């Protein structure tokens, strides 16, 4: 059936979100801001209420990188 109607769908998206955050922050920790933010914006994109996530990010990211993030939001 359509996405979301299967028990396994919620597990896949939680795993996807964790992966994307871990990958993004690893890439950021290497200096690859652009690809890191790509992954962070994928994580945000599957999150139904990303208010605190965005807040922490804007708190913690360099401001030109946060700007990049918004461009890719």
């Amino acid at each position: 059936g359509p996405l979301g109607s299967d028990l396994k769908d919620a597990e896949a998206v939680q795993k996807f979100f964790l992966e994307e955050i871990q990958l993004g922050e690893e890439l950021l920790a290497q200096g690859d801001y652009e690809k890191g933010v790509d992954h962070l914006t994928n994580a945000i994109a599957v999150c139904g209420q990303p208010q605190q996530l965005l807040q922490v990010l804007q708190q913690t990211l360099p401001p030109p990188v946060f700007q990049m993030l918004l461009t890719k939001l």
Partner: peptide, 12 residues
């Protein structure tokens, strides 16, 4: 560092 990811997870 890559465990920064735990902070982002805690935001939910």
């Amino acid at each position: 560092g890559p465990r920064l990811s735990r902070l982002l997870s805690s935001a939910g």
